[PDB]
């Protein structure tokens, strides 16, 4: 293996990884930062964000208000000292992105406009247009080009990390074009790989969001926290699972059943508001979860429209007017027209709930550091303890820059005072990654990876969905267990070397099975209903602060078992009640 020397290595060039690379480059102008990603930075998921990034700005707002919002929304499973740090730094980060050129939409006087998301009372979500993530990722990426300190390893699939005596020493990745392995040595490594939605049959995610980073941390004794909280977005296209921003509704859209009845009123979110004025907290602007559940309920009554791509409900936007329809929300109107073939000016959009965000992720302290010295995690793949049992809308993008900057600064420090490690041990680790890879390649069995992938998704969709029952969760646990056994009988028929996606997709699949199992076990074990986790079995239908006001820690031992442990939740000023 060829070897590269770097002060810190960042795995992931998404919102978080980039913000991380820059903060590290500005912190230490002399550092040599290795930014690694399996796709060119701009193809990262972040690019697909359409709603906005939260940051306190209106005069009648207050960090307190954002703090509260965040804590309540997370059903008190938030690390309160962290949330505080978060709200206080958003304004700075969003403002900085502006300075870097991010074209945030404006008020006629030149100031940046803001809009409501996540059900917040005080609007505070900054926005590009409905292309915010595209604009943030791209501003960040481009901004990063000016710092020579950052050396990119585009299209380099990071395989495993190198750990010895509790401290990280680098990583082994594979040059995708070349097909050759590489050793990047660094006394600090920042994991910024993204979420794991892709383990679900229908999601809003991009192909690349497979949970690699999480799976990697799992192999080294690090635990994934709160993996049971998977967030579903209420309005996604059938089949594709492509997201239809909350904006549609915030503008006036309504959701109706096969009878064109705005069913949401019969679920505690009434009274119906007029086509004219949408009102936060009511109807189509009600609690996220309630809206997604209402779908299920309508489904039981047989009120959902039947379609091939599946059952759905309708997202009617006609009453906005072409100019608003076509001129204001271009993309969507284009998305809708293209993927379900429907003009939002002439007809209604079919939609249903879809797997969307991964609350869980690699456990980290308030500085984004893991139990392994020098190993940090930041971004959706982590768990700083900001979202608890339910992320707030527009808080994820914010996080990317707020904690990515921290992760960057902290990692810099941790690599400066790291000291040296056992060369023969580290090199032995690398040799191991190499060996393991060979083993997978030579593995035979005639099992099609793709079918395992498909089954995994159907399992998560049935066992870990909007409403859970011990029976089906268990069923899913059992399924995944099975699939794990099948994964070992998979044969990667492509032995080529230039851009071998057959192999890379197969590796990605593994991490997914592992990550999936931490999700399921976590859920089956949380005998309560909190945030995104909702059970229907007796004694589990309510929130239990007496027995479950804690985080779920999921560990995967060398014998392939997923064990759980629980940790306490740091309260500061907002005790639960």
């Amino acid at each position: 293996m060829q070897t590269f020397q770097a002060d810190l290595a960042i795995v992931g060039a998404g919102g978080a990884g980039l913000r991380a690379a820059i903060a590290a480059a500005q912190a230490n102008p002399n550092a040599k930062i290795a930014l690694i990603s399996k796709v060119y930075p701009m193809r990262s998921h972040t690019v697909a964000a359409e709603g906005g990034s939260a940051a306190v700005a209106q005069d009648h707002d207050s960090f307190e208000y954002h703090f509260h919002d965040t804590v309540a929304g997370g059903d008190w499973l938030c690390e309160q000292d962290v949330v505080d740090y978060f709200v206080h730094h958003c304004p700075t980060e969003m403002t900085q992105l502006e300075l870097w050129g991010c074209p945030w939409s404006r008020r006629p006087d030149g100031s940046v406009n803001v809009r409501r998301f996540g059900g917040m009372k005080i609007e505070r979500t900054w926005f590009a247009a409905d292309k915010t993530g595209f604009h943030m990722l791209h501003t960040l990426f481009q901004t990063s080009l000016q710092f020579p300190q950052i050396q990119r390893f585009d299209e380099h699939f990071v395989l495993d990390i190198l750990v010895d005596d509790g401290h990280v020493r680098g990583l082994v990745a594979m040059n995708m074009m070349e097909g050759t392995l590489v050793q990047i040595r660094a006394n600090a490594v920042v994991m910024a790989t993204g979420g794991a939605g892709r383990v679900y049959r229908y999601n809003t995610n991009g192909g690349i969001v497979t949970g690699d980073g999480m799976g990697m941390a799992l192999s080294h004794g690090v635990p994934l926290r709160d993996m049971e909280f998977v967030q579903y977005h209420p309005t996604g296209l059938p089949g594709s699972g492509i997201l239809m921003t909350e904006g549609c509704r915030g503008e006036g859209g309504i959701l109706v059943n096969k009878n064109g009845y705005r069913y949401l009123q019969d679920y505690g979110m009434g009274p119906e508001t007029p086509l004219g004025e949408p009102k936060n907290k009511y109807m189509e602007l009600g609690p996220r979860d309630k809206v997604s559940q209402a779908f299920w309920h309508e489904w039981r009554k047989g009120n959902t429209i039947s379609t091939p791509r599946g059952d759905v409900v309708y997202l009617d936007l006609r009453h906005l007017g072409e100019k608003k329809l076509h001129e204001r929300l271009p993309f969507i109107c284009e998305l809708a027209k293209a993927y379900v073939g429907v003009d939002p000016v002439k007809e209604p959009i079919p939609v249903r709930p879809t797997a969307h965000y991964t609350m869980g992720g690699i456990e980290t302290d308030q500085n984004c550091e893991t139990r392994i010295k020098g190993l940090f995690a930041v971004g959706e793949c982590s768990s700083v303890g900001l979202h608890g049992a339910n992320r707030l809308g527009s808080n994820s993008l914010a996080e990317l820059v707020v904690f990515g900057r921290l992760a960057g600064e902290q990692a810099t420090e941790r690599a400066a005072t790291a000291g040296n490690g056992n060369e023969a041990a580290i090199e032995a680790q690398a040799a191991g990654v190499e060996q393991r890879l060979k083993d997978l390649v030579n593995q035979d069995g005639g099992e099609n990876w793709a079918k395992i992938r498909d089954e995994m998704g159907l399992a998560m969709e049935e066992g870990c969905g909007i409403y859970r029952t011990p029976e089906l969760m268990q069923k899913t646990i059992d399924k995944l267990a099975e699939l794990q056994e099948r994964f070992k009988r998979v044969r990667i028929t492509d032995t080529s070397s230039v851009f071998n996606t057959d192999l890379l997709y197969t590796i990605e699949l593994g991490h997914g099975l592992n990550v999936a199992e931490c999700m399921a076990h976590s859920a089956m074990a949380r005998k309560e209903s909190r945030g995104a986790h909702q059970r229907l079995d007796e004694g589990c239908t309510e929130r239990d602060d007496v027995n479950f006001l804690k985080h779920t820690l999921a560990f995967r031992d060398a014998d392939g078992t997923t064990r759980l442990e629980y940790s306490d939740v740091k309260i500061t000023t907002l005790p639960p009640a």
């Binding site: 796709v39 193809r43 404006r106 100031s111 192909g207 492509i242 073939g341 071998n500």
Partner: protein, 243 residues
């Protein structure tokens, strides 16, 4: 029911076996929603696991999709079989080296893109001071040109590029333009050199095909023309300064 089938011709190429690219034909199920990306998936899952290609978002926003469909550069995820019942031939994005199957060397593009300093230059304002003030009016100056997803379809469309691989390209220039037009930037001079190059705006003879294909209606062509005009002003200014 019973899904229709479509023989799709894909141009395969393995640099470890093949001396030159060669077609292959696959029968793929399809309906009024099936996209080329969908089709490629089905192939790799059931007919040919060694079929490599780039992709990600599945919604025409990331831009890794880039490829040729019946000689027209397009995005695999925004291309639908329903519109190719009389034959479909899929090849690697034109004017780029084919590395493997439908994957090409995007290096030049990246380097070009890096070459024009796509980033706010010379503004000293700092976070604690608040954000810059920029009106919608001001934003309208560069907005359209910021919607570029670096997909690469304009380079496959530009004949000038196909004839001059050293041409920095539509996208590259548009990006530069975008910053030159942002009221917040103050580094136009840092970018002109490259724009003034023979390999810059001047390599373009306004064929216009680029804008025809931009899956995000950025209109690179318009950016390049405006570019020439600025280059032109730069050339004058530089002339009326002796020495």
């Amino acid at each position: 029911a019973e899904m229709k089938n479509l023989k799709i011709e894909v141009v395969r190429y393995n640099p470890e076996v093949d001396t030159a690219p060669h077609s292959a034909f696959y029968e793929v199920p399809y309906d009024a929603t099936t996209s080329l990306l969908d089709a490629l998936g089905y192939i790799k899952d059931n007919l040919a696991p060694d079929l490599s290609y780039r992709w990600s978002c599945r919604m025409a926003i990331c831009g890794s999709c880039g490829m040729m469909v019946n000689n027209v550069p397009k995005l695999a995820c925004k291309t639908f079989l329903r519109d190719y019942t009389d034959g479909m031939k899929v090849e690697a994005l034109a004017n780029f080296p084919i590395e493997r199957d439908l994957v090409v060397d995007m290096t030049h593009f990246i380097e070009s893109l890096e070459a024009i300093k796509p980033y706010i230059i010379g503004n000293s304002r700092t976070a604690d001071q608040g954000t810059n003030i920029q009106t919608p009016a001001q934003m309208a100056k560069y907005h359209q040109f910021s919607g570029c997803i670096n997909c690469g379809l304009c380079y496959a469309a530009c004949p000038q590029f196909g004839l001059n691989p050293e041409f920095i390209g539509p996208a590259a220039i548009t990006l530069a333009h975008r910053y030159n037009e942002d009221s917040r930037d103050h580094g136009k001079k840092e970018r002109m050199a490259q724009l003034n190059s023979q390999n810059g705006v001047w390599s373009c003879t306004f064929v216009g095909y680029c804008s025809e294909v931009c899956p995000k209606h950025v209109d690179p062509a318009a950016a390049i023309q405006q570019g020439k005009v600025e280059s032109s002003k730069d050339f004058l200014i530089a002339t009326l300064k002796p020495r």
